[PDB]
Enzyme design. Structure first.
Site, PDB file in Angstrom:
ATOM      1  N   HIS A 187       0.808  -1.219   0.000  1.00 31.76           N
ATOM      2  CA  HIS A 187       0.000   0.000   0.000  1.00 31.76           C
ATOM      3  C   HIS A 187       0.848   1.279   0.000  1.00 31.76           C
ATOM      4  O   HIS A 187       0.279   2.359  -0.109  1.00 31.76           O
ATOM      5  CB  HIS A 187      -1.063   0.013   1.097  1.00 31.76           C
ATOM      6  CG  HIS A 187      -0.540   0.139   2.488  1.00 31.76           C
ATOM      7  ND1 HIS A 187      -0.546  -0.939   3.350  1.00 31.76           N
ATOM      8  CD2 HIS A 187      -0.080   1.228   3.150  1.00 31.76           C
ATOM      9  CE1 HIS A 187      -0.091  -0.480   4.508  1.00 31.76           C
ATOM     10  NE2 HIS A 187       0.219   0.811   4.434  1.00 31.76           N
ATOM     11  N   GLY A 205       1.750   5.623   9.688  1.00 27.75           N
ATOM     12  CA  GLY A 205       3.173   5.637   9.355  1.00 27.75           C
ATOM     13  C   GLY A 205       3.946   4.460   9.943  1.00 27.75           C
ATOM     14  O   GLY A 205       5.086   4.200   9.541  1.00 27.75           O
ATOM     15  N   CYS A 214       3.316   1.348   9.428  1.00 29.57           N
ATOM     16  CA  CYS A 214       3.304   0.218   8.505  1.00 29.57           C
ATOM     17  C   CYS A 214       4.702  -0.098   7.989  1.00 29.57           C
ATOM     18  O   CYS A 214       5.511   0.803   7.771  1.00 29.57           O
ATOM     19  CB  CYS A 214       2.302   0.424   7.376  1.00 29.57           C
ATOM     20  SG  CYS A 214       2.159   2.139   6.820  1.00 29.57           S
TER      21      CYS A 214
HETATM   22  C1  Q60 Z   1       2.192   8.381   5.413  1.00 33.48           C
HETATM   23  N1  Q60 Z   1       1.488   7.110   5.535  1.00 33.48           N
HETATM   24  C2  Q60 Z   1       0.177   6.921   5.741  1.00 33.48           C
HETATM   25  C3  Q60 Z   1      -0.002   5.571   5.694  1.00 33.48           C
HETATM   26  C4  Q60 Z   1      -1.267   4.775   5.653  1.00 33.48           C
HETATM   27  N2  Q60 Z   1      -1.823   4.371   6.927  1.00 33.48           N
HETATM   28  C5  Q60 Z   1      -1.182   3.603   7.832  1.00 33.48           C
HETATM   29  O1  Q60 Z   1      -0.043   3.851   8.205  1.00 33.48           O
HETATM   30  N3  Q60 Z   1      -1.840   2.481   8.256  1.00 33.48           N
HETATM   31  C6  Q60 Z   1      -3.086   1.972   7.658  1.00 33.48           C
HETATM   32  C7  Q60 Z   1      -2.979   1.755   6.148  1.00 33.48           C
HETATM   33  C8  Q60 Z   1      -4.107   0.941   5.562  1.00 33.48           C
HETATM   34  C9  Q60 Z   1      -5.410   1.429   5.546  1.00 33.48           C
HETATM   35  C10 Q60 Z   1      -6.446   0.662   5.035  1.00 33.48           C
HETATM   36  C11 Q60 Z   1      -6.194  -0.603   4.540  1.00 33.48           C
HETATM   37  C12 Q60 Z   1      -4.904  -1.094   4.539  1.00 33.48           C
HETATM   38  C13 Q60 Z   1      -3.865  -0.323   5.038  1.00 33.48           C
HETATM   39  C14 Q60 Z   1      -1.218   1.620   9.268  1.00 33.48           C
HETATM   40  C15 Q60 Z   1      -1.714   1.884  10.671  1.00 33.48           C
HETATM   41  C16 Q60 Z   1      -2.268   3.105  11.024  1.00 33.48           C
HETATM   42  C17 Q60 Z   1      -2.714   3.316  12.315  1.00 33.48           C
HETATM   43  C18 Q60 Z   1      -2.585   2.290  13.224  1.00 33.48           C
HETATM   44  N4  Q60 Z   1      -2.061   1.096  12.916  1.00 33.48           N
HETATM   45  C19 Q60 Z   1      -1.641   0.916  11.657  1.00 33.48           C
HETATM   46  N5  Q60 Z   1       1.211   4.992   5.502  1.00 33.48           N
HETATM   47  N6  Q60 Z   1       2.123   5.930   5.401  1.00 33.48           N
END
Ligand code: Q60
Ligand code: Q60
Lengths: 304, 304
Positions: free
Chosen positions: A41, A143, A145
């Protein structure tokens, strides 16, 4: 003596963490040898997450669109491929800090350490269990992930988990290092049901043995039970059924304490039926299930 | 979301751990720059521990009697000195893995990560608090001495604790990195009284704020209290008195949640007087006091 929720030393994993950016999305990656592993993702914007077609989204991306930064130096991306829910970015440099490692798919009920990271930088380390319903009760923010779960056997790091998402319920879902989700989860912004969770019975029994070893014995009683009688009680209290395999792994703890597994089961039965009556076991006011029999033996023997 | 007892990433500290042997006694040492710090009881046999005269015991020892091993390579000892309850072994090689570091004496109620080590090798990492009575509820076995406690601010490791002993009560006692014991403890095999311990009130309040941020709000009530009324309740339940200094440090959490500190105090008061009624807060069935306001902010903001 003393018993703590102890994590593995995270050094070998810290040396593998990198930051991966694609477009405007930044997350963590794991650099082992000349490959960087990260959640697929990373190629999506928040808008793409509603129903992403990863194959189509990835086709718009070239090697130069994946910016990989290790500390302060940039890695040159020479290949990219999607394997299940992970992207594998081939880089032209092997990580000099690559430890001896393996990729393993852990079983539900097993434990591991998580090195929570943001922007490729480690913030903290904690121990957790893969729940029977294949979620983890982590501590992760946006963030995080690409942060990974692992175990260490002397010099070998067995990577078992890569963090992908948080369900609307506040629990966490992720994959093995081949990108296969643990559980029925999909990497999409849609409400997803985690199954009914249960308590990891063999782990609670292991923790009761750890309590006896460390001096907390008030819960020991004059009773015994059978596997069938105990499982009627486990069923009622949403505990996973205890099997002879579980009794077998509890053998070393039973031998060390001189308390037969079924006798410990009868103590667990009375604790389930009566509660703790305002008392604590190893500083906890509930039955802990995040320590496997192996963790209890390791912590109680000081394995490095 | 989610809230875990998170430790700092231990990598920077793992690169400092060495094994120190003197005679037949082996323990852990901390190699920073060209100095190895370890508990001074490394010069004692079990027999010497009843009433050691460290000055006399150390006089029988020369530089060549202190064997320091870093991984698999031996360090050449060129100087030795005793500072309070620690020995400082000057070595001819500066540790190439020495991180930016400071030696700090933490206050009771503050938290830190411990990297438990055996034979100079790291086995695990856990977070703990220095109790108000200057003990720590660690997880340490024979040979764990010399394991250190620390905090990390971006790239700087602040070493605050070196493990020395376990009291007959099962709790742990140690020193700052200048060898000054926290508390009234002495490095001698004699029964020693740890004071009456109390609950770290400001930390429980910080943890109640962390619970609100993460969705656990059942404990919030329609009441408020005063510092004086709350302290009458804290006194009765062996909680440390809350001061305006404590309210001031809780400011950011109070501002983030919109719950005035005294309103959170009234929730704590009702929890103290009524218990949890079989409910949990952040997966705990008791009031947790091992998270400072700074830890809650750090974990809830993802500081790396
Ligand atoms: C700058 N940025 C934003 C993101 C996207 N967001 C994240 O980090 N997460 C979710 C991504 C997602 C959403 C929906 C279906 C699959 C995956 C992981 C998360 C968040 C909160 C608590 N535990 C885990 N990555 N990098
Ligand atoms: C091979 N070897 C043996 C030892 C000595 N023993 C230890 O390790 N501890 C105690 C030393 C001590 C005793 C009495 C007064 C002061 C200090 C530390 C400890 C043990 C158990 C739980 N937590 C801490 N060191 N190295």
């Amino acid at each position: 003596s003393g018993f703590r929720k102890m994590a593995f030393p995270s050094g070998k994993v810290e040396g593998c963490m990198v930051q991966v950016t694609c477009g405007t999305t930044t997350l963590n990656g794991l650099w082992l040898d000349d490959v960087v592993y990260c959640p697929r993702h990373v190629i999506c914007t928040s808008e793409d997450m509603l129903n992403p077609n990863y194959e189509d989204l990835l086709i718009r991306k070239s090697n130069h669109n994946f910016l990989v930064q290790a500390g302060n130096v940039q890695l040159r991306v020479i290949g990219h491929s999607m394997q299940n829910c992970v992207l594998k970015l081939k880089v032209d440099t092997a990580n000099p800090k690559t430890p001896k490692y393996k990729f393993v798919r852990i079983q539900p009920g097993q434990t591991f350490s998580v090195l929570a990271c943001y922007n490729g930088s480690p913030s903290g380390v904690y121990q957790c269990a893969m729940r029977p319903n294949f979620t983890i009760k982590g501590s992760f923010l946006n963030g995080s992930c690409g942060s990974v779960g692992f175990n260490i056997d002397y010099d070998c790091v067995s990577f078992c988990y890569m963090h992908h998402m948080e369900l609307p319920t506040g629990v966490h879902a992720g994959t093995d290092l081949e990108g296969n989700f643990y559980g029925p989860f999909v990497d999409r912004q849609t409400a997803q049901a985690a199954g009914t969770d249960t308590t990891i019975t063999v782990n609670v029994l292991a923790w009761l043995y750890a309590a006896v070893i460390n001096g907390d014995r008030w819960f020991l009683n004059r009773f015994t039970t059978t596997l069938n009688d105990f499982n009627l009680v486990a069923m009622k209290y949403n505990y996973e059924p205890l099997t002879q395999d579980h009794v077998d792994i509890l053998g070393p703890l039973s031998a060390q304490t001189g308390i037969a597994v079924l006798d410990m089961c009868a103590s667990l039965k009375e604790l389930l039926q009566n509660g703790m009556n305002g008392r604590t076991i190893l500083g906890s006011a509930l039955l802990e299930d995040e320590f496997t029999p192996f963790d209890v033996v390791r912590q109680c023997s000081g394995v490095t």
